Amino acid sequence: GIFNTRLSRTFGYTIKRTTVKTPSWAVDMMRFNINDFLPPGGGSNPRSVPFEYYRIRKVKVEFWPCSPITQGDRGVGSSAVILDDNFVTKATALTYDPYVNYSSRHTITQPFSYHSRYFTPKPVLDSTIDYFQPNNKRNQLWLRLQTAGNVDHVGLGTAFENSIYDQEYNIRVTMYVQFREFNLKDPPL
Amino acid sequence: GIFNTRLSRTFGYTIKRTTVKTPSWAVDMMRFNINDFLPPGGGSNPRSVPFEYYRIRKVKVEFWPCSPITQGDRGVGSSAVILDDNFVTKATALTYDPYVNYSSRHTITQPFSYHSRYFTPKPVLDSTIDYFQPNNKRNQLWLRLQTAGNVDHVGLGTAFENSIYDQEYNIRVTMYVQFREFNLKDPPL
Amino acid sequence: GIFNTRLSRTFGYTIKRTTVKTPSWAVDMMRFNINDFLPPGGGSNPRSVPFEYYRIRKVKVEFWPCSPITQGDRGVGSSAVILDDNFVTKATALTYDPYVNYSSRHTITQPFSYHSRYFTPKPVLDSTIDYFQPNNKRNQLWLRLQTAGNVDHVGLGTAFENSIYDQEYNIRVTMYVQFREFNLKDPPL
Amino acid sequence: GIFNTRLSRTFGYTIKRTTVKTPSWAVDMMRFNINDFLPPGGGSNPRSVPFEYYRIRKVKVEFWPCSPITQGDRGVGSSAVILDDNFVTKATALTYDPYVNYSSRHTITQPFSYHSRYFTPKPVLDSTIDYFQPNNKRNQLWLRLQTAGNVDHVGLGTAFENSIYDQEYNIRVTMYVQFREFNLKDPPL
Amino acid sequence: GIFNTRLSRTFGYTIKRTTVKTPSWAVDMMRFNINDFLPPGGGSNPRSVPFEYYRIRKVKVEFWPCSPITQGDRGVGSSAVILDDNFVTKATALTYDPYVNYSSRHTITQPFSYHSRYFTPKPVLDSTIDYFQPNNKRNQLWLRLQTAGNVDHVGLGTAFENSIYDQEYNIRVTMYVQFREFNLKDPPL
Amino acid sequence: GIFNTRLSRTFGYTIKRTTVKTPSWAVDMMRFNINDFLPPGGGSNPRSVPFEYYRIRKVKVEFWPCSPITQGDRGVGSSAVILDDNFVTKATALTYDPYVNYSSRHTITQPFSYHSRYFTPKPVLDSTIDYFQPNNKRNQLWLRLQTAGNVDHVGLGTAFENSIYDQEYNIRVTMYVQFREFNLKDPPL
């Protein structure tokens, strides 16, 4: 019983100002979990979408700027796809862009420019070995939609060039999911 | 955002015994409401299936017998489709089968025989005028999935021939519904 | 060195009687392990079928009744396919059939009727995440035929309607397996 | 339930040295039994390959030398196929090669040369009459895989020319067999 | 960013002499890890090949002999492919060749003969269950190129026939690997 | 062993204000060396990218503005390709644009506008004679990847109109190179 749908979530991210003169970059990570998109249900149905299995097909991360088009001290960054839960260490002012030479690098124009990334994440099945599957719609694993313990999906790391002014963003993540085995429970009343 | 699914519900019906010698029939009615198939949800989602609109496409009423194949004093009844909320009055021992000459009559062999009816019900929009639409999948009205006040659908009346022995049935109603406008609400936690 | 064969096993299951008047259902689970079908071998060959690897292709669960065709208080249940080791909790008299709205539900006529289910199980690789593969004969994983520690395969849950009389069954599970790498060891004597 | 497989076995054979000056030959025989290739099983399965019937299709006898390529006093012998259990009498130093004029003679170069023979043996059904079947894959008799009393198959006799030095060989016999009627027994535990 | 290349490594293996008269075999195992082929890098690049992911496509194990062609007491062994990290126990003088009846057995002529094996190994993801994938270039898992903790690949076991003389070999393993996501880091200086 | 790839780097360039009233321009050159893009390796491998050879195909210079779009006192400049390491003399405020009439001139809008150039640089073999090859992908030379002594490549010089305000740019370079002769070294540990 397949049901492809779309789930979204919005949150903020700010790159604080720095008095540093050099071009330094701010590094951070981004994971994706389905608990943040799918709330708990009620009653005999533990989740709000009554299905048993799921598998995330795609994610769309949108960096919607919060800064005016008149803001100066512009910069240039990079967003890369990291499917293994080993990101570059979080840094405030690093002397280089680590994600620049990555094959999945897209340039981030800053601060007043929109940046989208559309890709297929991978689940963290074993963080010790960090193995994942290649892209195959027919062979992608089905995970279970747990009650409160779903596994973290992974796949984006960023590097933003710091500035004299604060750079704020409203980040909207949209997960395109595919469920299976409609499992609604209908007790009496 | 269409989602065709199937919702079921099971309950009992008994035709009590009678010392009456004549062939008399027991008349009863059967309505269908979605509150009995779809429970209330939890939180910002008032219902367990997160959709706004619905329209019932078909219903399958199954009379599953509870009586052995050795039971005697067998009989013959009738099930008809009544799409207007004006049934023959409920009777314990009526001297005739009212639903026998109906164009939608199917014979009910009793007591140990299975009887199915598969039809398209109609909602009770105005009980004073009792108007309904003909069968058209493209023009069928969309109703709202209310929180606790959904409208009764209608469409089956029965007439069972009484017997010296009690005739029990387990009735399983299955509604084939079609929802629209996925309306999940995801507050923070 | 492929060798497709068929292994069987027979055991009993009883649904005890209840004085409860309502229609209640008895819920139970069913797992499949190869130790119960393949005994230990002898000598340098740890198992009786001299192969290294295996993968279960299909299972046929047959509920052969033990009750006469004259037994009354008949009922109606459901059998569903549960490929993840999270079954509905075992219950003696539950007020509803949980497996009724499942997409893999087959109706169980009770008590004197035969019920078969033919499906492809999945192994329990990680019970925490509960991931499994879709059906693909070419990409199905090969497991190792361990000596005394094989992994449990999963895939059936049932719900039987209780009765005044005891409902007994002789359950015959047949696993259709596929082995690989003939590994017979022939020491002298 | 046919299963064609391959069973092997390795053992030694030595032609001891002789001070005799003349060219003399050492004669010996070679039978084939399935007990030497198939060990006893364990439990309710008396044999390690769980089948009832068998029939030997082919045998490959390989004389793998043990002697260096610098060894002198080389010689020339003969291997023939003897399907009736009446071999030339075993001799240490016979004044001629008895198997030389046989229609199934292959020359054995000695001592450091490989010799293979690939043929279809015959079972010893009656040693008094010594009757056997011609080669026909469709009409070949099925024998029973006994527990500890299988019948000897026959089909090779050799004649090695003696030498001043010892001539050792590692003989690897490979039987290509065909079983029938998978008969595994699975008691409880 | 794919880059198919070839990495090699050379090491020794000796089968010590034995006074035992019988034909006995020496059993040993062979695993493959990428730390032994890829050294650690320097600086911000933890490895010498600047890539993130890898997957081993093929391995070529070459037994280059160290013994002269005049060496006697020759023998015959077997090399088999074992993709699950459960080898036959290491033995000095075992009374039989365990890897002889394996479907992946290749004969090892000893001592002065070259033996190659070209196959696709499998990683040890779970040693408890020992599951692996079949051969599929498009669906083969990508592993991470760790810093100092890469996972062991597996796939060869051997059985050498012992001798009066020591049998030495220089074993050259060549792994054909496929990397992904060029991740060079270029800080200033 | 060919390997095409991409390397990049980022640095700043500013044009200090001038109280001069006339239209004056500021001149500066730009060289290209691989040591700035490719850090040193570690251990036996002197460089992080294990190859012997390289030859630059293309370079992509990117003038990313740091200024707002509201800035006044706009101007206009020029850039040109210079393949000999004999540029126009560096100047602060020159009364004309030297690089205007060059055939390889691309106009530069200032101060808030993007500017890019995509060309083939050339090496400096002999600064005295200043010779090179026409563009040819097949006949281009292969240079050696030295340890700390690689040669400077060349190919860009600029001219920026001065202003009352400071014009700051973030310059990103991108090189498209092509290596050869994979030269990895695997000592033991």
Ligand SMILES: O=C(O)[C@@H]1O[C@@H](O[C@H]2[C@H](O)[C@@H](NS(=O)(=O)O)[C@@H](O[C@H]3[C@H](O)[C@@H](OS(=O)(=O)O)[C@H](O[C@H]4[C@H](O)[C@@H](NS(=O)(=O)O)[C@@H](O)O[C@@H]4COS(=O)(=O)O)O[C@H]3C(=O)O)O[C@@H]2COS(=O)(=O)O)[C@H](OS(=O)(=O)O)[C@@H](O)[C@@H]1O
């Ligand atoms: O006759 C004249 O016009 C004289 O002009 C002035 O001499 C100045 C130079 O003009 C000035 N350079 S400017 O850019 O033209 O202003 C400055 O040169 C030094 C700078 O570090 C570099 O100059 S630049 O022109 O390349 O920018 C340059 O560094 C070179 C180095 O010279 C190279 N070796 S050499 O063989 O050429 O000597 C090589 O080592 O690479 C270096 C780095 O180059 S890179 O491009 O950065 O990679 O040369 C430097 C140098 O030679 O000193 O200084 C010159 C000397 O004057 S001062 O610095 O002592 O003041 C003078 O007048 S004024 O204009 O300064 O007032 C005067 O000598 C004449 O009028």
